[PDB]
Amino acid sequence: XXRAX
Amino acid sequence: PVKPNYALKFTLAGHTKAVSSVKFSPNGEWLASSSADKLIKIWGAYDGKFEKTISGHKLGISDVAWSSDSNLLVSASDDKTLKIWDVSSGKCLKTLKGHSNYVFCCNFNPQSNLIVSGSFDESVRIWDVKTGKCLKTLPAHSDPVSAVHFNRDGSLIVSSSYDGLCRIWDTASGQCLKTLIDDDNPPVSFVKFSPNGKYILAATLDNTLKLWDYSKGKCLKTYTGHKNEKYCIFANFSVTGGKWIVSGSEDNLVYIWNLQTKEIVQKLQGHTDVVISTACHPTENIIASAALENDKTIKLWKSD
Numbered sequence: 001x002x003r004a005x
Numbered sequence: 006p007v008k009p010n011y012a013l014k015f016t017l018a019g020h021t022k023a024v025s026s027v028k029f030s031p032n033g034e035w036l037a038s039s040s041a042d043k044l045i046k047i048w049g050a051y052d053g054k055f056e057k058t059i060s061g062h063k064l065g066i067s068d069v070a071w072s073s074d075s076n077l078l079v080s081a082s083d084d085k086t087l088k089i090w091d092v093s094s095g096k097c098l099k100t101l102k103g104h105s106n107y108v109f110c111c112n113f114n115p116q117s118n119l120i121v122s123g124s125f126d127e128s129v130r131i132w133d134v135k136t137g138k139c140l141k142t143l144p145a146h147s148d149p150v151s152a153v154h155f156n157r158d159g160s161l162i163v164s165s166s167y168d169g170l171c172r173i174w175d176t177a178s179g180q181c182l183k184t185l186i187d188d189d190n191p192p193v194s195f196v197k198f199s200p201n202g203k204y205i206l207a208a209t210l211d212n213t214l215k216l217w218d219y220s221k222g223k224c225l226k227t228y229t230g231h232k233n234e235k236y237c238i239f240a241n242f243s244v245t246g247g248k249w250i251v252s253g254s255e256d257n258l259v260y261i262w263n264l265q266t267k268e269i270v271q272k273l274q275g276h277t278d279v280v281i282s283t284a285c286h287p288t289e290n291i292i293a294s295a296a297l298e299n300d301k302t303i304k305l306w307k308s309d
Contacts, residue, residue: 001066002067002107003025003068004025004041004298
């Protein structure tokens with residue numbers, strides 16, 4: 001991938 | 006050590022998608038790298054020399070962490086699992102199913118004998134390494150949890166979330182000690198336990214970086230000047246040549262403040278897209294930096 005958005 | 010001089014040395018390309026996190030080996034000889042392309046890539050922490058590529062996740066990875074003994078990695082991926090790998094091969098040891106949504110963050114305790122993990126299901130889970138079984142599930146917050154970190158001894162986990170909350174949990178107990186409301190419920194993008202363990206470094210999505218004495222619930226230093234209001238950007242404590250703070254920024258530069266004077270001290274230009282994560286090499290004063298989909302590369306910077 002949530003981190004990469 | 007008034008001002009540093011981090012100059013760009015190498016530029017590392019290999020990830021076919023955006024890079025989610027880069028983390029330095031304990032011994033410092035290696036530099037792991039998680040990406041949105043379901044892969045992990047191992048690199049020489051001193052020269053660049055891309056070594057290994059570890060694969061196995063069905064969807065991309067948001068975070069990886071190292072084991073104290075420098076030879077196991079756990080990756081938090083968006084297929085609701087975490088996976089424990091040995092780097093002395095590339096083989097996946099155990100897969101830690103349990104979560105209900107995307108798994109966002111992961112971290113090893115100092116003893117490397119258990120995993121702490123956060124996910125989009127608003128719950129933090131603690132796991133044992135060998136028996137890939139969820140040791141306990143904490144109803145952490147009521148929103149996805151941004152970051153999760155073990156304190157320096159191993160008896161405290163700090164978690165942060167989108168509900169503007171930062172919690173301090175005792176591990177072998179699960180009961181929460183405190184929580185840092187203290188304001189206008191701004192989404193906490195990230196939090197890290199400070200080196201000596203008596204503080205936490207929290208990131209909120211309003212372009213600020215705050216260092217808290219969570220003991221007293223006071224904020225002690227406040228670092229601003231960067232852009233951070235959409236992505237949960239990692240932060241670091243550079244403690245080799247002078248005591249600074251490092252964090253990425255949504256303006257594609259690496260911001261460095263002097264830990265002791267809230268002062269911008271150096272900003273490193275090189276990235277085409279957002280800088281999502283950095284890392285400071287243990288012994289040698291090297292900072293790594295990774296960027297997103299319109300960049301997808303890593304950079305090592307040496308100086309002091």
